[PDB]
Symmetry: D2
Subunit: 377 residues, 4 copies
């Protein structure tokens, strides 16, 4: 208790230190943090406690022939219940099919020269296919798992925003892409000694921000997920018509988002589902900003009898290794999905499958909410 | 254990039911969820468990003359440590000043008519100042706390996207604005019996999506937060110059975001800080998407000797009543900030103060990360 | 010819001076400008000649009960021919109906203070309804025709972007809104002597740039134009189906523009028609950038038998007085439309009608090109 | 005159026909088009006349070591005069340096399949480097000058937006890229007989619309143009300081455009200069919408003594062959610049040089207007 004393004049004595700081904070603050638990968490895995978010289960989600019980960390029973209704409707409709369209994490440092002419010489150097193997060798010293895929260099005046894209195995891969970029920036001091490195991120990555570069180019896992709901199931189960769902999608998710001046927001509530699964599975909750990017498409097929439904999500940023993924509670949620840790089969397959599951759960959420709106007409 | 049996052929027997579903899920799934705790949570407050996120403390944050210990729910000690460094630098610089520029939650139903001419008659009706008091009376039956502020009606063909804005006291207010919109849509069946209500949300709100309507118009709390760091402190404490910080802000947060095609992403990592405080204080983590919207400005003042730093955040969506805010752990975090529950002084003052604290913590995070980048040159 | 001499050692001796500069330019340049005419133009109305663009006629365009022969200044006979086909199809379909949703030109100076707190005091002052009549009196000294409608002040750090909106009679009104803004900025030196005026335009207007402020808020004339094409005419004349046109609109103008990351570009070729009419009628060709902003909507009506078609154009910037509108050739084109000069009925009615004609011609162009694409399937 | 009769009962008897239609139009319309000339134009090169726009000269513009007299087709003497002031300031500052960063015209058809899985198979086929030479051979039958550079396929649900990029020699190249796309779509019916071609343009090109695809990826000529103005010239000639110009650029062209929600509009008035040169040189005036895309950068160099100024313009769409470029008056304006017709040296060099001249004239306009604003403080 004398430790709490010196309040007078943290960075520690983990749990013992955790306990000391709590009393110091309540004493100095004058505020009770009574309902914030200390006990029940391994702090070895400036902590003062931990918050609790309840995990609900949505499913079974039938995806590429497999059944998933989707963990959703949220306050609202109504989000789990609604996603669950979407899972049931797709389960009797042959389930969902996912396709991974692209897989690579990006980092875009800003560097500058004395002229745009000189900056353009870095661009032409880096984008010359003959130089790729050398840049990749330098980059890939980053890690066992780092594989450079591309370098795109955008010039703005005497500045270059140099977008590196690489695979990172089952890691989300922000630390890996960064080490790789540092290798290439050090290697470049030979042919480019006039280069000033302004920052490891020039906001062209673009990390934890909505950006057209990510919508156009993708970032992390670019995924499309689709299902066909038969007319008879749209009528009997979803209590609407093919026509009403197609029209609502066009008026709400396409025209409405257009009128609102949306960037990547051509969907009903992808953000709700992405956030809940992200927190359950120990992802970075700040990457929900670009991971929720989605265009929902609903089209009449088979002479207007059935509906083709899809979500296209260009920038799902997930990993199954590192960060919050290796805490006990979040690890258990990845294990439920069968994507805990690195892939046995081939590096990155677990993080890819996680991305397809997010997209499948988003498709279920879109079908359920859009059906409820349409049925309520 | 026979309950787990009928697996054969949730919506319950709260904790007792919670326990039953867990065994049913592990048995049916074939997957261990061993490290997901059941015990230690009041389920009365389809749950199968809860995840734990550790809470670190950033501060003291000196804001409008008061000192705050900012709870940050995150995996990374480095985010708390960095935000803490920003708090110290501002604490010796006279602290931060916040200004609330606007406060109101929005909902934008999509309705349609047989013609754009007819849709325009709803627009001119709703936007006619003589009709406001009648619309407000109908709207404000929503709640003791519901106060209609404005109605803006955007026409797209024969469709109207009708944006309602109202104060909601200390509630985030999505349910309140929605009840109010339903009152007005029912009242309108008199003068507009030809009106088809397509949906309570036409994506023009715009909720949990990045949209220019929210950047231009605001949503929830629109806040600016500012501080002045003296040259001598920029040199000795932040290990950089006024010139280097102003140039990095222009090249990274302004030019870089512009080159990336950003919408509201004119900042270094507002999303990181917003997400951590949002989860600590039981906010909706999906509203991080628009609540992270921020332009960071850094300008040389006093003949280039000092630096004026600010964040302008048009759409911070927070409440201190309802949702996750009334769970034990998240309640304790609001109580630390002194903004638990409804305002004693005047309804909405707690949710406003919470918004200013988020903006202050974001300013600290921006100063710390931008200083570290600049100092690393 | 000695004048051309002093080539030796812009701003003049109008036609006489025009002729002198031409020889000086060919002599000094070494380049023949033989095919650029000098004769045939009244230079009294550093000119070296004039270019010629041929004027084709599209119509009759049946709009709000009147018939128009639409002058289109363009190189391509195919653009006039296609727009003409659209006019015919609408002419047998009952013609088009326009609605003016808003009419006001904007200017947004950037001003700054020592703090965001102080900048916010200008915001609250300017947006306080009690101050409006005083601001309007100061503003409206601008002109006989200047009528202030609104002032919106956006704060970014210690800077204010102050958006003034006013009616300007039949003038496009950029010079009028500017004089009015100067009056208000001078009047404000009393209560705001600390205010630094950084520029008369802070790019928030936003003039001759694509900006979400103009898409969301409008600028100049905000217009919707609509028509109904009967199934039998879609089949027999346009050689397609209602279903094919609705699907093409959703896949091309909505989904396609969304995938492209469009701002206000939810249309097939509004820009082609706007540019041609703008140049014919002596408008500012640089304002084509925001005047082409358009969402094209095509919806099945009457149990899928007929198609409702519309264009919604939030920022058509036109005048019938001042600028190029009072040159001989462009005056003749306005006179063809019956909108030459100021309105006899009421100030602004000619410029409003011109805006509805542009929207009608755009609707015709959209119907023709979209029908040709659909029919080509 | 009996021809005008049958008014009774567009497509012709060129000038003879031109004359007939004029009387028919005045008779039927009741409107005089007296000041629209018929005589003075070769109609062999549904015309009813031609408009006249006066051509002013800006320069000399010193660009990559050469001097240019820049033809500007505009109503306002003040735009030519202002651009002229910018040319003088750069002329005594060592002139401007341009760099072409990319050169290729794009077309993006929308095609669809029964599934996103099947659509993804077209993507992987088209983006497989092993298939490139076959696709290029099929594409390049388009023309002597058509050279396929890249194919990027974006999937949205069961739809593919397939972006083809090719060089087109000195032609703007919209017709060439289109023939090439038709070759590839016909060749694909072998391996993809299930493919439905919805349209030759799916708005992902993106032609005559502001789109992030063009800002991020470029379209036509991507150009950067730069100059250094010495402190002594900023003081004595431009009547401002290096500090004031850098601050105005950051507050107006960067922060202001950001606050406005601009896409590619990070500049003062690029649109004004682009439109004037486009019309003078017979370019497509509708392509001003994307050709005006520009970020203006102004940075203090040499210990704050001098200013580095640049424009980066990702999508300048110009040709010197075909369209309006081969009319007499517009041909004379290209000839003044020394870029009339196809390149003798190497195909495309004339259209590239034209693009660098536009960028140089835009830089001059930006320097002049920004200096005038700064000097007026």
């Amino acid at each position: 208790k004398s430790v709490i004393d010196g309040i007078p004049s943290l960075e520690s004595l983990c749990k013992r230190a955790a306990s000391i700081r709590r009393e110091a904070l309540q004493r100095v603050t004058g505020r009770s943090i009574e309902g914030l638990p200390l006990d029940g968490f391994d702090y070895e895995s400036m902590p003062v406690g931990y918050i609790q978010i309840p995990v609900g289960i949505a499913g079974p989600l039938l995806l590429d022939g497999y059944e998933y019980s989707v963990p959703m960390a949220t306050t609202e029973g109504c989000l789990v219940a609604s996603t669950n209704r979407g899972c049931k409707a797709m389960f009797i409709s042959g389930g969902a099919t996912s396709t991974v369209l692209k897989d690579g994490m990006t980092r875009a440092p800003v560097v500058r020269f004395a002229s745009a002419r000189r900056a353009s010489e870095l661009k032409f150097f880096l984008e010359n296919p003959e130089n790729f193997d050398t840049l990749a060798v330098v980059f890939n010293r980053s890690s066992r798992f780092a594989r450079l895929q591309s370098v795109k260099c955008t010039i703005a005046g005497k500045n270059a925003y140099v977008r590196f894209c690489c695979s990172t195995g089952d890691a989300m891969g922000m630390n890996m892409v960064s080490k790789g970029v540092q290798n290439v920036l050090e290697y470049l001091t030979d042919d480019f000694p006039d280069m000033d490195v302004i920052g490891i991120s020039g906001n062209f990555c673009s990390d934890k921000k909505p950006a057209a570069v990510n919508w156009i180019e993708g970032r992390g896992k670019s995924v499309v997920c689709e299902a066909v709901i038969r007319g008879e199931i749209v009528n009997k189960v979803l209590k609407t018509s093919v026509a009403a769902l197609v029209e609502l999608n066009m008026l709400k998710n396409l025209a409405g988002s257009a009128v609102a001046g949306s960037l990547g927001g051509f969907n009903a509530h992808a953000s709700n589902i992405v956030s809940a699964v992200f927190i359950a599975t120990g992802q970075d909750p700040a990457q929900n900003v670009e991971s929720s990017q989605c265009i929902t498409m609903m089209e009449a097929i088979n002479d207007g009898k059935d509906i083709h439904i899809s979500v296209t999500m260009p920038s799902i940023e997930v990993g199954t290794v590192g960060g919050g993924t290796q805490l006990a509670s979040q690890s258990a949620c990845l294990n439920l999905l069968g994507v805990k840790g690195a892939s046995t089969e081939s590096p990155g397959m677990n993080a890819r499958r996680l991305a397809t599951i997010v997209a499948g759960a988003v498709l279920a959420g879109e079908l359920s909410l859009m059906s409820a709106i349409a049925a309520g007409q």
